[PDB]
Amino acid sequence: KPSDLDGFIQQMPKADMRVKVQLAEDLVTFLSDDTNSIVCTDMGFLIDGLMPWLTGSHFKIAQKSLEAFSELIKRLGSDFNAYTATVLPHVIDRLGDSRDTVREKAQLLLRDLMEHRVLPPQALIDKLATSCFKHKNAKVREEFLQTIVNALHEYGTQQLSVRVYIPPVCALLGDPTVNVREAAIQTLVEIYKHVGDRLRPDLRRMDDVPASKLAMLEQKFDQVKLE
Incomplete structure (x- = not known):
């Protein structure tokens, strides 16, 4: 009408x-x-x-x-x-x-x-992070990781600095929900594509990240390197 x-x-x-x-x-x-x-x-x-x-x-x-x-x-x-x-x-x-x-x-x-x-982009992702990393709903936590991935892919490191995001994303490796744990893994892999090998020692200092996941993440990065 x-x-x-x-x-x-x-x-x-x-x-x-x-x-x-x-x-x-x-x-x-x-x-x-x-x-x-x-x-x-x-x-x-x-x-x-x-x-x-x-x-x-x-x-x-x-x-x-x-x-x-x-x-x-x-x-x-x-x-x-x-x-x-x-x-x-x-x-x-x-x-x-x-x-x-x-x-x-x-x-x-x-x-x-x-x-x-x-x-x-930095303003929005930071603002989302405040509400999303610890949201009660696992689907929000998972979707937000994807928002980060999409924003990085679309804007690159020129407008989005993810260094400060590594520790909260790493915290999600131990999420009680498998969908989020797996999303967190893939998110670090996507960040590796933009950030490169300097991510490896960054994660190695993350006393959060179990050695077993550090190893698994490094295998996935190596795999990416075979572009």
């Missing part, structure tokens, strides 16, 4: 489950088309409106809110950073969502924040 942002904003609060999903789908469609305008009364009103969707129990609508935020990030760029502190904590929680597509759109929102320069 709605023809502009103000129209979406007005109809969001009242809307019943029925039209709520259609509204979500159309909102995303609207924001995706760069021939559509994001003129409205107050952008904060749209942000506030998306919040119950994002923090909600319907995951289709949550996912669309993430997609909606991605579109605002793309249009707003650094201007979006006014809303980062409000949105980020719930996007983090969605990294742990049971539905694979929800985690995807959440990870994509995170990449969009960096690609569209809402904040520098």
Whole structure:
């Protein structure tokens, strides 16, 4: 139905489950088309409106809110950073969502924040680290390691310094969950690709890392070296 942002904003609060999903789908469609305008009364009103969707129990609508935020990030760029502190904590929680597509759109929102320069890659990863390394949900801990990997692969050591990340990633080698232990391994391997052999003595000083895992990690690095 709605023809502009103000129209979406007005109809969001009242809307019943029925039209709520259609509204979500159309909102995303609207924001995706760069021939559509994001003129409205107050952008904060749209942000506030998306919040119950994002923090909600319907995951289709949550996912669309993430997609909606991605579109605002793309249009707003650094201007979006006014809303980062409000949105980020719930996007983090969605990294742990049971539905694979929800985690995807959440990870994509995170990449969009960096690609569209809402904040520098180091700023975002550091901020995530605060909430993610010790999150109660193993899927968040695992997803966050992947966020680090993707950010490194996309931006390289020019914008992302992972030296200070080695000890917390190493701590995850002893995670109570096997999926995380294995993710932590692969993350160090991915970091090796960027950082090179200086990582080896770095890990050797990590009295955390058992010799058996140091050895296993070194085998994996050697294997990478055979490019």
